[PDB]
């Protein structure tokens, strides 16, 4: 009873980062060989585990985040790194075990002109805990009750677009990624193999 | 099953505008990814303009560029499109048609399923 | 950008078709998306096959797909009498336009 693997990485329409996706897998024998296959994988590495020894192991629940990020950010994405792509879009805990996934797509995202379907959240009050989503739609404020609809020299609207274009340098083309995630104490071995 | 009917087509004059409304029966049009086809007169396809599932990306055909503007009535369920300063050119039948993989996990290529019944616009004196 | 279909064929019930329609090096060859719809005199063109070798549902087998380089070809067996209708190939591209159809074919059967 084989896992999903190749129907999550082969999915035709990913999330944008802010309004990410989970979806849990287990029940099921996961073989981690068959992911070197697709793209040219610019980052695969792993905290807590190593990959070599990944074939082998049994875990509780393992979860898998996707999502489309910039291509100077893929960096932000790490166990307790500060920056502005895990501070209010999305955050990772500091005690973090899985792996990640990324490689830039800019032959499936980015058309000519910008493309204008990614978008993220450059103003939050405050900061957010690990592993929690917000899409509550609230304009910033500017030392007043901030403006109900308009935008003045602040009030301005919370997503901003990506705009990914074919021609960027590599930093600013998408990344499509993934995130590997899974507890080991040892609890009822629900998957492996 | 799923309908996808059209309303407000016809005759009109040069340089006027027009309003089409694309009614969705059979399913919710809040989350499928629309895109009008226009047909001219004895002649193939050719695509108009799309809307997006977000409501934060929309592409326009780039002949009807600078017009023919579109829109969504999520209030109403339909799709609005409206084209404005038109020209002797124009005339054809338009289908509106939603793109099938508007799921999550689809790992399938897109294909203009659900198809409109399609009216037709006729500019000139 | 348009694709680039041909005129017309035909054939008696028991023979079998090919057209070809070929296009660019970023919207048929690249990406492999293209897709076919039949479309008979006053009705809304229906799908007939995507993704190539997926046959979607009520399609008879009679149809079979193929994509070679930049040249998409079609296959029918079995004419029949029905495939009086015309036949258009579309498909996805990434400049502008994220849809092209083909010139259109007429399929006459004698």
């Known amino acids: 009873n084989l896992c999903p693997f190749d129907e999550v990485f082969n999915a035709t329409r990913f999330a944008s980062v802010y309004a990410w996706n989970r979806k849990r897998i287990s029940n099921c024998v996961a073989d981690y060989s068959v992911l070197y296959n697709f793209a040219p994988f610019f980052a695969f590495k792993c905290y807590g585990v190593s990959p070599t020894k990944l074939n082998d192991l049994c875990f509780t629940n393992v979860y898998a985040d996707s999502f489309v990020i910039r291509g100077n950010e893929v960096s932000q994405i790490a166990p307790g790194q500060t920056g502005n792509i895990a501070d209010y879009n999305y955050k990772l805990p500091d005690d973090f075990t899985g792996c990640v996934i990324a490689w830039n797509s800019n032959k499936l995202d980015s058309k000519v002109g910008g493309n204008y379907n990614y978008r993220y959240r450059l103003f939050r009050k405050s900061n957010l805990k690990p592993f929690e989503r917000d899409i509550s739609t609230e304009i910033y404020q500017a030392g007043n009750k901030p403006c109900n609809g308009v935008a003045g020299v602040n009030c301005y609207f919370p997503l901003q677009s990506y705009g990914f274009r074919p021609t960027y340098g590599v930093g600013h083309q998408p990344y499509r990624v993934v995130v590997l995630s899974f507890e080991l104490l040892h609890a009822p071995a629900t998957v492996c193999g | 099953q799923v309908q996808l009917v059209e309303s407000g087509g016809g005759l009109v004059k040069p340089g006027g505008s027009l309003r089409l409304s694309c009614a969705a029966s059979?399913?919710?049009?809040?989350?499928?990814?629309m895109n009008w086809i226009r047909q001219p007169p004895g002649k193939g396809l050719e695509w108009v303009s799309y809307?997006?599932?977000?409501?934060?990306?929309?592409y326009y055909g780039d002949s009807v560029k600078g017009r023919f503007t579109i829109s969504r009535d999520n209030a109403k369920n339909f799709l609005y499109l409206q084209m404005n300063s038109l020209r002797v050119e124009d005339t054809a039948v338009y289908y509106c048609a939603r793109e099938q993989p508007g799921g999550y996990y689809d790992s399938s290529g897109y294909r203009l399923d659900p198809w409109g019944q399609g009216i037709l616009v006729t500019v000139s004196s | 950008s348009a694709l680039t279909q041909p005129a017309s064929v035909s054939g008696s019930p028991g023979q079998s078709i090919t057209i070809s329609c070929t296009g660019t090096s970023s919207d048929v060859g690249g990406y492999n998306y293209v897709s076919w719809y039949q479309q008979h005199p006053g009705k809304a063109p229906k799908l007939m096959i995507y993704d190539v070798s997926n046959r979607p549902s009520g399609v008879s087998n009679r149809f079979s797909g193929s994509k070679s380089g930049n040249t998409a070809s079609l296959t029918i067996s079995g004419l029949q009498a029905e495939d009086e209708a015309d036949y258009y190939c579309?498909?996805?591209?990434?400049?502008?336009?994220?849809?092209?159809f083909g010139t259109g074919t007429k399929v006459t059967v004698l």
């Open positions: 809307i997006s599932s977000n409501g934060y990306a929309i």
């Open positions: 579309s498909s996805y591209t990434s400049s502008s336009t994220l849809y092209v």
């Open positions: 059979g399913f919710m049009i809040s989350d499928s990814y």
